[PDB]
């Protein structure tokens, strides 16, 4: 706290998913405030995706030294790494075609080739067991979070999920969350009956900004 | 837990809104000496829309029969007798015959393809791939 004074001076003069780089944690909001009895946290965000990416690249034959190349591999993540929609299909794509394979130039001039790991690395967000963590995963967690709260306006929550932060802009992420959540909204509400979900209610948020400009009256 | 998009609402599924050609006609004209007349008769009233493959495969079997019932130098005269529309349908059937190994059915079909192509051009081949109306 005594390190805050230097910061202040010398200067001037809905459900929400937030990932910056340290970790993400869904935050539901009822009325004008959050919900203390809720707001569950997930132990994985960006660093874990970079680290897992390093390990995966190691498995492909590119031996990046771990505590030496973090900024480089991180830089490589935010440019190719995306979130897969149907992992079975993505894996099929990786094994049978070359369309996912892209070249990347390193600071020392060397050019490497990166493929399936592009969708594999972010997948840890949905399958925490992949990194030896007793987790739940973004989708299951979000579902459980809205589901565990109230009953009065659950659905309303569902129709207002929004992504925030630099580590949630991975391509396909919104569509993935929506579909996987659909599967949850089916494997946790009616052990079957694939003819009632045709009356679903859920849209993935996350627009184009980073200006957390909060104010109102005054 | 599982596909759910196949159950999405903004889905895309062609509508089969709106038996076969004429076996008989493929007789009288097949043929007191008229081969062209037979070909023009067989390409009349195509099934289509009919989900079942039985009826479709029937018209296709018949058409292939006719195509086989042909000499080499006399194909050209017949094909050139067709309208722009006719060539496309003939072409659809040629490609149909290219799905199964009905003997030399392919040998003559490549001949039945160059000349047929000559009448309707390459554009016709595109219509065969761009049609939710099957054969």
């Amino acid at each position: 706290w005594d390190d805050m004074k230097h910061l202040w001076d010398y200067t001037f003069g809905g459900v929400v998913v937030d990932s910056g780089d340290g970790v993400t944690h869904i935050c539901p909001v009822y009325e004008g405030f959050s919900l203390p009895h809720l707001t569950r946290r997930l132990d994985i965000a960006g660093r874990d995706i970079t680290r897992y990416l390093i390990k995966l690249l190691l498995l492909r034959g590119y031996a990046f030294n771990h505590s030496a190349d973090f900024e480089t591999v991180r830089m490589i993540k935010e440019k190719l790494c995306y979130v897969g929609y149907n992992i079975e299909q993505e894996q099929k794509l990786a094994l049978e075609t070359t369309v996912l394979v892209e070249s990347y130039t390193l600071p020392d001039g060397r050019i490497i080739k990166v493929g399936g790991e592009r969708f594999e690395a972010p997948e840890a967000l949905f399958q925490p067991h992949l990194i030896n963590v007793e987790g739940v995963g973004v989708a299951e967690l979000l579902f459980n979070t809205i589901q565990a709260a109230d009953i009065d306006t659950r659905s309303e929550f569902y129709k207002h999920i929004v992504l925030s932060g630099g580590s949630t802009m991975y391509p396909g992420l919104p569509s993935r969350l929506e579909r996987e959540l659909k599967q949850l909204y089916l494997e946790r509400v009616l052990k079957g009956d694939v003819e009632k979900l045709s009356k679903f209610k859920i849209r993935i948020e996350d627009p184009p900004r980073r200006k957390h400009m909060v104010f109102l009256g005054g | 837990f599982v596909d759910v998009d196949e159950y999405d609402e903004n889905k895309f599924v062609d509508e089969d809104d709106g038996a076969g050609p004429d076996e008989g006609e493929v007789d009288s004209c097949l043929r007191q000496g008229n081969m062209t007349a037979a070909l023009q008769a067989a390409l009349k009233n195509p099934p289509i829309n009919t989900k079942s493959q039985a009826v479709k495969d029937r018209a296709g079997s018949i058409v292939l029969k006719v195509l086989i019932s042909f000499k080499a130098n006399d194909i050209e005269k017949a094909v050139q007798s067709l309208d722009k529309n006719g060539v496309d349908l003939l072409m659809k059937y040629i490609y149909k015959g290219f799905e199964s190994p009905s003997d030399n059915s392919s040998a003559v079909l490549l001949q039945w393809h160059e000349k047929a192509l000559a009448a309707g051009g390459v554009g016709s081949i595109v219509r065969v791939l761009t049609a939710r109306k099957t054969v």
């Binding site: 034959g61 031996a63 990046f64 030294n65 505590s67 030496a68 190349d69 390193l106 | -």
Partner: protein, 400 residues
Amino acid sequence: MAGRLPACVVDCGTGYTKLGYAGNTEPQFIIPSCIAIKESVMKGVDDLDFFIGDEAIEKPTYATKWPIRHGIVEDWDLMERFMEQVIFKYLRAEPEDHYFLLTEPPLNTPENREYTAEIMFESFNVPGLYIAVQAVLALAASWTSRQVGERTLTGTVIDSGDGVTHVIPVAEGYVIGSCIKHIPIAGRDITYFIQQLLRDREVGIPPEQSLETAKAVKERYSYVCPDLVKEFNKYDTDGSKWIKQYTGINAISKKEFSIDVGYERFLGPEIFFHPEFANPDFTQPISEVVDEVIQNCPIDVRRPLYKNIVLSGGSTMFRDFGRRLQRDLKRTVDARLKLSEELSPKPIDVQVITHHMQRYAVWFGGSMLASTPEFYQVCHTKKDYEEIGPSICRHNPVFG
């Protein structure tokens, strides 16, 4: 050792190739990796009409080719033929019942790793293959300190053989990426210097073979001196014994000439610490290069990297080379940490390891590792290649 039969160990370098059987101390044959091909349209066995090694650099009616540049295979066909003769002529050991343990330089790509598998597995019915990185093999080749034990795969390997110097920093059995450095001074360069220094002193020199003299003097009379002026003074005072003489016979000239060998003995290897002594475009001393390299690595394995410096290659064999490194580096780092301290953490321990197997250190490390049962597990089996693909060679798990 192992299943009665011994495994195959092959270390392919730009210049010399070291080959032999596991368990041995020294390679069975060390030969230039050149390959002689014809030029007079494949016509049957026209591909088999070729020679390799020394036999490739003597056949007039044959063209000499060099498949390895700066360390990478640039021509796979010639490399494949080369391996044909490596296996079926020199090693004289079946490739369908003898495990293989090739090698690769750091900064080598996964594709090359896969090719090194396509050739070995699909042509040569070999039962198993492992691809080791040269610098890491150079690392194993050193536990032979004094006493006792203390195995580690964390250290910095300076590999200087005959082409170019290399400073790859290994960590936990894994070499660092953009942490490797090259110095355009090496054996070949050292021979040229000593030659240019003698050409302007001794007379009656060999026509088309004026390098041989300076080449033979290098590894046979060369050494590292501590203080240059003190050494010069030595020679100018107690001659006849500090100064030595070497003889020889003219090659493409035929003539018995005997010459004196003096200052060049210590001035030659001295270029290492003073590139500006022969290379006008590079003047940074090797000690500084090593220091820069260590400083580019992560702030935590740095100290350990300083603690385990190992040598590899024939160009590191000059007497007291490691000792000289210790003086210069300790002096530089202490001066640095001195500056630090004064403007106001205990001295960093630097250690250069110098074993017996320095020249072909890579091969030796290879033979020793390939000599253990623990190897017949980490190897890639014929079973995995014949079902999964060459892709299994993309990753070659470490052990030891």
